[PDB]
Scaffold this motif. Structure first.
Motif, PDB file in Angstrom:
ATOM      1  N   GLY A 192       0.385   3.507   5.969  1.00  7.57           N
ATOM      2  CA  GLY A 192       1.339   4.468   5.385  1.00  7.57           C
ATOM      3  C   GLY A 192       2.501   4.602   6.128  1.00  7.57           C
ATOM      4  O   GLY A 192       2.701   4.126   7.478  1.00  7.57           O
ATOM      5  N   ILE A 193       3.707   4.943   5.607  1.00  4.63           N
ATOM      6  CA  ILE A 193       4.952   4.748   6.195  1.00  4.63           C
ATOM      7  C   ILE A 193       5.698   6.208   5.788  1.00  4.63           C
ATOM      8  O   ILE A 193       5.328   6.843   4.960  1.00  4.63           O
ATOM      9  CB  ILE A 193       5.991   3.578   5.613  1.00  4.63           C
ATOM     10  N   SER A 194       6.867   6.058   6.440  1.00  2.00           N
ATOM     11  CA  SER A 194       7.764   7.459   6.276  1.00  2.00           C
ATOM     12  C   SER A 194       9.162   7.073   7.021  1.00  2.00           C
ATOM     13  O   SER A 194       9.139   6.285   7.668  1.00  2.00           O
ATOM     14  CB  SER A 194       7.068   8.749   6.646  1.00  2.00           C
TER      15      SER A 194
ATOM     16  N   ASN B 279      -4.045   7.786   8.079  1.00  3.43           N
ATOM     17  CA  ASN B 279      -3.611   7.326   6.615  1.00  3.43           C
ATOM     18  C   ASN B 279      -2.282   7.086   6.211  1.00  3.43           C
ATOM     19  O   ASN B 279      -1.787   6.083   6.063  1.00  3.43           O
ATOM     20  CB  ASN B 279      -4.499   7.907   5.623  1.00  3.43           C
ATOM     21  N   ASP B 280      -1.551   8.341   6.455  1.00  3.00           N
ATOM     22  CA  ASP B 280      -0.131   8.343   6.208  1.00  3.00           C
ATOM     23  C   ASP B 280       0.461   9.657   7.063  1.00  3.00           C
ATOM     24  O   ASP B 280      -0.392  10.421   7.545  1.00  3.00           O
ATOM     25  CB  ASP B 280       0.244   8.586   4.432  1.00  3.00           C
ATOM     26  N   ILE B 281       1.813   9.412   7.223  1.00  3.10           N
ATOM     27  CA  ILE B 281       2.421  10.622   7.721  1.00  3.10           C
ATOM     28  C   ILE B 281       3.744  10.812   6.912  1.00  3.10           C
ATOM     29  O   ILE B 281       4.242   9.978   6.073  1.00  3.10           O
ATOM     30  CB  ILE B 281       3.127  10.145   9.190  1.00  3.10           C
ATOM     31  N   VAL B 282       4.270  12.079   7.061  1.00  5.34           N
ATOM     32  CA  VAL B 282       5.476  12.170   6.605  1.00  5.34           C
ATOM     33  C   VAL B 282       6.585  12.746   8.110  1.00  5.34           C
ATOM     34  O   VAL B 282       6.183  13.713   8.582  1.00  5.34           O
ATOM     35  CB  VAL B 282       5.474  13.489   5.499  1.00  5.34           C
TER      36      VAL B 282
ATOM     37  N   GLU C 295       0.891  -1.294   0.075  1.00  5.08           N
ATOM     38  CA  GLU C 295       0.081  -0.064  -0.028  1.00  5.08           C
ATOM     39  C   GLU C 295       0.905   1.327  -0.140  1.00  5.08           C
ATOM     40  O   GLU C 295       0.559   2.430  -0.483  1.00  5.08           O
ATOM     41  CB  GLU C 295      -0.929  -0.111   1.168  1.00  5.08           C
ATOM     42  N   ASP C 296       2.056   1.598   0.660  1.00  8.63           N
ATOM     43  CA  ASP C 296       2.803   2.390   0.582  1.00  8.63           C
ATOM     44  C   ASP C 296       4.358   2.036   0.740  1.00  8.63           C
ATOM     45  O   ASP C 296       4.675   0.726   0.937  1.00  8.63           O
ATOM     46  CB  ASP C 296       2.447   3.054   2.021  1.00  8.63           C
ATOM     47  N   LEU C 297       4.954   2.834   0.203  1.00  6.89           N
ATOM     48  CA  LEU C 297       6.533   2.523   0.042  1.00  6.89           C
ATOM     49  C   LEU C 297       7.621   3.475   0.132  1.00  6.89           C
ATOM     50  O   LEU C 297       6.853   4.809  -0.129  1.00  6.89           O
ATOM     51  CB  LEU C 297       6.749   1.440  -1.350  1.00  6.89           C
TER      52      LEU C 297
HETATM   53 CA   LIG Z   1       4.075   7.613   3.172  1.00 10.80          CA
END
Ligand SMILES: [Ca+2]
Ligand SMILES: [Ca+2]
Length: 328
Positions: free
Chosen positions: A89-91, A141-144, A36-38
């Motif tokens: 989500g990833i960061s 959902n996601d982070i930065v 889903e996220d990379l």
């Molecule tokens: Ca992300």
């Protein structure tokens, strides 16, 4: 009523994708339950969240290899319950001492957390450091990441209750919001979104980009030194923009998109969702250059969420399906 036509624009109910082909794309062996996220480090290592659900894991790919293979990163530590791990989500954040932190949105059950890991490269494993949760992180959902435990986070819903948030999404309340988290201060920095999803930052730290999935928009904000965000531009699109990646060399945005919202949100094996990747150049200018770099009806890759480029190659992830690795 009017809420019938608005739902239908929001979910792109009759859009069909115009294919754009890339001549040497290969499915990544080992990825069959989502990517889903990379995120790709400057050295060419790519982290991938998988098994996202609405067993989860973080995968690693060395994109400096000719035929890169995935390995599952082992989670080390006694502060995390692995059995409920459900990454979204990833960061990453790389410190002065060159330590690589991986931040991972986790949905164990119906709650949201952000998990902080230290990447242990030689061992190819993840050392768990901390579980973050907060009233202002209800539905992440996601982070930065802007530090080892500092980030901007999208909440794609206001409510936590799965039944209430289902309704909030169908009504189009647009109550989703973006939260800045740090050890010393947690606060809302933007609000009023029709499902905020991807989020990222310019390489000089001066701008933050937010994907408003169901409004089909990408917002650019000025990021001040006190971590406040002020609106600057809104770009509009004909597709459901999901996760945003940033090429560090150019600042270009690379975006995974869902052409049709019905096919991604109301799955049907006989009519799978397709995939679509946008490149956005010169996002601050009068006419930003938007290019469809890849698009297909899902015969190969279903439900693209994210895409990023490393040294001529394009890596594309999906919410629940496979992953694609292509020559540009
Ligand atoms: Ca992300
Ligand atoms: Ca997503």
């Amino acid at each position: 009523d009017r809420q019938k036509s608005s739902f239908q624009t929001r979910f792109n109910v009759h859009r069909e994708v115009t294919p754009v082909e890339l001549p040497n794309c290969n499915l990544v062996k080992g990825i069959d339950n989502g990517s889903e996220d990379l995120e790709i480090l400057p050295n060419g290592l790519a982290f991938i969240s998988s098994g996202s659900k609405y067993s989860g894991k973080i995968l690693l790919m060395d994109l400096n290899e000719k035929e890169p293979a995935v390995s599952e990163l082992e989670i080390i530590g006694n502060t995390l319950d692995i059995s409920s791990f459900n990454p979204w989500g990833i960061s990453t954040f790389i410190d002065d001492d060159n330590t690589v932190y991986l931040l991972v949105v986790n949905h164990p059950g119906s709650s949201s957390t952000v998990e902080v890991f230290k990447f242990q490269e030689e061992e190819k494993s993840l050392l768990h450091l901390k579980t973050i949760r907060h009233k202002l992180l209800p539905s992440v959902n996601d982070i930065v990441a802007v530090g080892p435990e500092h980030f901007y986070a999208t909440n794609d819903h206001y409510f936590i209750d799965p039944y209430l948030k289902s309704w909030e999404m169908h009504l189009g309340l647009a109550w989703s919001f973006v939260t800045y988290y740090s050890p010393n201060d947690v606060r809302v920095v933007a609000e009023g979104f029709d499902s905020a999803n991807g989020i990222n930052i310019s390489p000089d730290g001066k701008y933050v980009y937010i994907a408003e999935l169901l409004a089909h928009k990408i917002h650019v904000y000025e990021k001040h030194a006190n971590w406040t965000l002020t609106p600057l531009r809104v770009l509009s699109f004909d597709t459901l923009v999901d996760n945003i990646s940033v090429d560090p060399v150019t600042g270009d945005l690379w975006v995974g998109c869902h052409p049709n919202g019905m096919r991604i949100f109301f799955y049907d094996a006989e009519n799978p969702p397709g995939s679509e990747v946008l490149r956005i150049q010169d996002i601050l200018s009068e006419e930003p250059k938007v290019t469809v770099v890849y698009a297909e009806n899902g015969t190969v890759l279903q439900g693209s969420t994210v895409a990023a480029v490393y040294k001529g190659k394009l890596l594309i992830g999906t919410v629940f399906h496979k992953a694609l690795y292509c020559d540009l």
